[PDB]
Amino acid sequence: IVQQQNNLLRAIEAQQHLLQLTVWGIKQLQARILSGGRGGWEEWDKKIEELIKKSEELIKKIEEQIKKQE
Amino acid sequence: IVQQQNNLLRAIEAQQHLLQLTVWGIKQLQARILSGGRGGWEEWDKKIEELIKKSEELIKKIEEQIKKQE
Amino acid sequence: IVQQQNNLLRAIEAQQHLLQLTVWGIKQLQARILSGGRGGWEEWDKKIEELIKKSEELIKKIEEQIKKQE
Ligand SMILES: [Mg+2]
Ligand SMILES: [Mg+2]
Ligand SMILES: [Mg+2]
């Protein structure tokens, strides 16, 4: 349960980076295809950014707790 | 390992909401760009919906188990 | 904490499959809409593929550790 939580965290991290990459691709599609590009997507961007930040801190939080144990 | 599992769950949740937001954006792209909009995407929608539901229940399940401990 | 880690893993898995499905949808959008289709996306594809593989192994790793306990 020691190395278990560590791999859970690492999996969560990878999924995080995945998610960020899909966000980038979807943004590129808006930019390339839509006549107004990323215009009007501002609020969707803010919601995405808020959850990425929240995710990033929790990750950091988990990392800290883990090594406080170690 | 107490507050560890709780932050893992919360991270999983955030990623969940992220994922839902990317799904929304991809659906908007289908709707706005494709001549037939979201037409023909029905099965992809069903697969997405099935995994979101599965995810949501597991989250709930984790939450319950956690506080049954508390 | 026994059945807790197991549901965390399963949630992570579901999110994984979700993520793969969004990747598929974004690839279909590139293919259908862009004049050059998926052309020029090769590096983005490689980054995605690298993180999916990493994710898949960690999942497998978690599964193994879990039942080594059981
Ligand atoms: Mg347009
Ligand atoms: Mg069309
Ligand atoms: Mg074009």
Author numbering:
A (entry chain A), B (entry chain A), C (entry chain A): 3 to 72
Article, verbatim:
After the binding of the gp120 to the cellular receptors, gp41 undergoes conformation changes after fusion peptide (FP) inserts into the target cell membrane, exposing N-terminal heptad repeat (NHR) trimer, and forming the six-helix bundle (6-HB) structure. Peptides derived from the HIV-1 gp41 CHR are potent HIV fusion inhibitors, which specifically interact with the viral gp41 NHR to form heterogeneous 6-HB to prevent fusogenic gp41 core formation. To elucidate the molecular determinants of these artificial peptides, we successfully solved all three complex structures of AP1/AP2/AP3 peptides binding with gp41 NHR.
For AP1 and AP2, an optimized linker “SGGRGG” was used to assemble the NHR and the artificial peptide into a single recombinant protein (N36-L6-AP1 or N36-L6-AP2). Interestingly, the crystals of three different inhibitors belong to three distinctive space groups: P21 for N36-L6-AP1, R32 for N36-L6-AP2, and P63 for N45/AP3. Moreover, the hydrophobic residue M629 in CHR was replaced with a hydrophilic residue E44 in AP2 and AP3. However, in the corresponding sequence (from W43 to K76) of AP1 and AP2, a hydrogen bond was established between S57 (corresponding to I642 in CHR) and Q18 (corresponding to Q565 in NHR) in N36-L6-AP1, N36-L6-AP2 and N45/AP3. However, in N36-L6-AP1, N36-L6-AP2 and N45/AP3, I54 (corresponding to T639 in CHR) can strongly bind to L20 and L21 through fully hydrophobic side chain interactions.
